[PDB]
Design a protein around this ligand. Structure first.
Ligand SMILES: NS(=O)(=O)c1c(F)c(F)c(S(=O)(=O)CCO)c(F)c1F
Ligand SMILES: NS(=O)(=O)c1c(F)c(F)c(S(=O)(=O)CCO)c(F)c1F
Ligand SMILES: [Zn+2]
Lengths: 261, 261
């Protein structure tokens, strides 16, 4: 299987996953020279993000990240098709180099990055069918930096203790996923790109919010140190750290912004 | 048939060149979390770098960078063996994006990068032999920013038109190679890494000088429009632009600095 380190690391993904060496690869550096204001980029509307407190949602350690399954009535309104949620998950660095976002801004990482994955439910029945198809996916990316304690992110992080090892699963009671989004979600970067993980299909409409969220030093350290990418009984355990892809070349292309200011 | 762009680009190099997916890969981003001062890193001495103006040195297109062959009596003093020079070459961007260094510093690219490749001549008869042996090679890297015209670099750039296509060769009169190095060569970054091109052997002792040199906008444009990766008669010409590898993960590796700060 693929990993972020050693022989099955990202320089080797294209051997079993040819799209990882093809066009439109993500993530990318978002820097001034390639930004272009596009007045067409109006605010997204987040529908069904207030998940029933009476429902429980599956949290899984899948050996690559921690993922929370989301219901298909949750969706984004404002794009060419309805894009329905399927899962969220995170990417981070490590305590010695706590700079593990996937996208960078003017060459700089953030501490971590949250992805809320949606699929084109007008065209496809589910995210696995959509993922390799034209206009299949839309991902929202939130950049995460260290700062004040974030009660909303703790609604996920308080369960990490139950998903410590690969394959493990816990349930999270519904809460308002919109609380994980930053201020002024009207301000965002938008470009066409790819999954940042195998099979790297170039099927993702990216929206990366301009403003980061904050979590505390303790929360960031918790995320960096809670999980393993190996099964519980593995005699050679490995910590799940540095689970981000390096930035990809992006030449003669623009990233559109909904802000000029 | 490896390239820097498209289907045979750097995410695919490991399909033919396994070490490109292995450990110790270069280049890297030099940033504070991975730096450590090392007082044992004393100044290098550059011996036989003042090449006779009455002698000439072969410049060649190899379809990857322009390389200038260097004589083996040119060498570095100060490492744990004598390292004798073999060649120098460059990496650069393109006219519309002059940001093609390989190493970055705190997430920023420089305009271009000069590599002066040396091999351990105490142990090996030639750089090719050395290149697949541990610490077989020592490369000096100079970061190049856009600035003032540089007459010394122009001693190379003025000959580019005789080496416009793959396989072409030209002769460059000797000059003092030390004129290509920056100020305060005593301050450098040192780490164990790899070739930045196929076959990506993890056999380089890297020294990246702290301080950049300048070349002008017109010199960068000349360099970025002078060369092709393809033969003269190729019916599908490809410009030699953007010939730099993305930075590589580097964790549980430190970069040692000969400067505190
Ligand atoms: N990092 S990323 O947001 O690019 C990304 C993933 F990591 C990811 F795992 C999926 S996926 O929803 O698992 C594919 C459908 O089965 C994605 F669809 C996806 F887009
Ligand atoms: N730009 S770089 O300096 O790291 C570099 C290479 F990438 C590189 F491949 C070689 S190489 O030793 O000629 C090829 C070995 O078969 C080099 F010699 C070399 F110096
Ligand atoms: Zn992701």
């Amino acid at each position: 299987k693929w990993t972020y380190f050693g022989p099955d690391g990202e320089n080797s993904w294209s051997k079993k996953y040819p799209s990882c060496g093809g066009l439109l690869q993500s993530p990318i550096d978002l820097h001034s020279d390639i930004l272009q204001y596009d007045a067409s980029l109006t605010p997204l509307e987040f529908q069904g993000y207030n998940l029933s407190a009476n429902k429980q949602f599956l949290l899984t350690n899948n050996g690559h990240s921690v993922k929370l399954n989301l219901p298909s009535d949750m969706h984004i309104q404002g794009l060419q098709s309805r894009y329905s949620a399927t899962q969220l998950h995170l990417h981070w660095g490590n305590p010695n180099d706590p700079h593990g976002s996937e996208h960078t801004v003017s060459g700089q990482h953030f501490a971590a990055e949250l992805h809320i994955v949606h699929y084109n439910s007008d065209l496809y029945p589910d995210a696995s069918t959509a993922s390799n198809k034209s206009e299949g996916l839309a991902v929202l990316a939130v950049l995460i930096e260290m700062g004040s304690f974030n009660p909303s992110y703790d609604k996920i992080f308080s369960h990490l203790q139950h998903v410590k090892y690969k394959g493990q699963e816990a349930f999270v009671p519904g809460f308002n996923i919109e609380e994980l989004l930053p201020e002024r979600t009207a301000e965002y970067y938008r470009y066409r790109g790819s999954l940042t993980t195998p099979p790297c299909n170039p099927t993702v409409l990216w929206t990366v919010f301009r403003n980061p969220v904050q979590i505390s030093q303790e929360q960031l350290l918790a995320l960096e140190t809670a999980l393993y990418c190996t099964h519980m009984d593995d005699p050679s355990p490995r910590e799940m750290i540095n689970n981000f892809r390096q930035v990809q070349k992006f030449d003669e292309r623009l990233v559109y912004t909904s802000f000029s200011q």
